[PDB]
Amino acid sequence: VQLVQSGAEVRKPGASVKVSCKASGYTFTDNYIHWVRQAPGQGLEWMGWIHPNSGATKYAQKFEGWVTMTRDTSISTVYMELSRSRSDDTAVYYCARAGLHPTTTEYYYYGMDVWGQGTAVTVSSASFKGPSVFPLAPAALGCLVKDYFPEPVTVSWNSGALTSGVHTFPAVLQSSGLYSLSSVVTVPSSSLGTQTYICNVNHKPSNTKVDKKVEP
């Protein structure tokens, strides 16, 4: 039994996100399905559960009124859309199934045993932008992809020919809302002038891919 959630989401404030949780491997109407939400780099927080059979909804205290949890049964999937999102709602949302059967008759609450992948939802007021790649001259070489959104930019060197010393770093989100990352590759000092290195920064969301060259 495995749960499959929807793809990653990136929406501006005011736009609605819908995370679908698909269940395969059991009688769909058997047990509950909860929706734990994890903030960026923080602890888990409960959102509520939905019984796919009856269709009832039980929402958490701070998640009521703006979170609607639906069910389909026909496609054997569960939803959890949030109409009119906000910039503080950026988080990784998780669906779970209460598959654990109680070890006692006193406390008959099924525990979460099967967990979905986790649809990383990112909500921010920034508009899409393409990374401007600059060369970092020199031993160690380097590249700079500056001021871009939304994550991710996939950086490799020489169209995948180089993997020895490449160490593409993590993006440092600036105050303006635009990300920025650098990629450095240590190449032998004797080779400079006898080898051409090219950044292969490729940013699909902005449809911007540039093979810029690093030269002294």
Binding site: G43, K58, Y107, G111, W115, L144, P170
Partner: protein
């Protein structure tokens, strides 16, 4: 209607880790335990003879999961939850960052690049301090320019581990082009476990 969990716990490999989840009237309730390795979704923990590393134990007031014979694959966050029958809330814990301190120290190699020549044609400047292969995680980074610290525009990454299981981070210092050409030299004074590494660049 709350559950307490310590923020950090450091245990040597092969020892015994003891995580606590403090509630009240939790004797009847059975607290489930979770394990969220970084990135991946949390996986619900499930407990001579058949040897057992994990033992779920509850004792009325504070229920403590005990990890025995700590392995490197146990380094993760651990959570606890229970159904509040009184208030009808499943209450999660704060999560305990179990850190396995088996790996030894490693001085951080620092690489610093000056503003690109193409940057300055756009009338903008951005230096870049790159600290790689550090350990454990302390990387206090300070920006000194022309023998004076510069704090305006310094932006540093929060440390994140890498493929070699050593932690590396980065720091950027946006600047005006007229200011960058004015001073004689710049420096990225990175401090780590009391030891400071420094690289210097100049407007050539």
């Amino acid at each position: 209607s709350a559950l307490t969990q310590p923020p950090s716990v450091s245990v040597a490999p092969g020892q015994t880790a003891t995580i606590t989840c403090g509630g009240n009237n939790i004797g009847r309730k059975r607290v489930d335990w979770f394990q969220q390795k970084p990135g991946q979704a949390p996986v619900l923990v499930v407990y001579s003879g058949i040897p057992e590393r994990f033992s779920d134990s509850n004792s009325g007031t504070t229920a403590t999961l005990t990890i025995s014979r700590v392995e490197a694959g146990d380094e993760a966050d651990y959570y606890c939850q229970v159904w509040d029958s009184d208030s009808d809330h499943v209450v999660f814990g704060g999560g305990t960052k179990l850190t396995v301190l088996g790996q030894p120290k490693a001085a951080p190699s620092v690489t610093l690049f000056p503003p690109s020549s193409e940057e300055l044609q756009a009338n903008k400047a951005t230096l870049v301090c790159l600290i790689s292969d550090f350990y454990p995680g302390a990387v206090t980074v300070a920006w000194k320019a022309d023998s004076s610290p510069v704090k305006a525009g310094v932006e540093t990454t929060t440390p994140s581990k890498q493929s070699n299981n050593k932690y590396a981070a980065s720091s950027y210092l946006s600047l005006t082009p007229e200011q960058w050409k004015s001073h004689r030299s710049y420096s990225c004074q990175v401090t780590h476990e009391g030891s400071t590494v420094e690289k210097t660049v100049a407007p050539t």
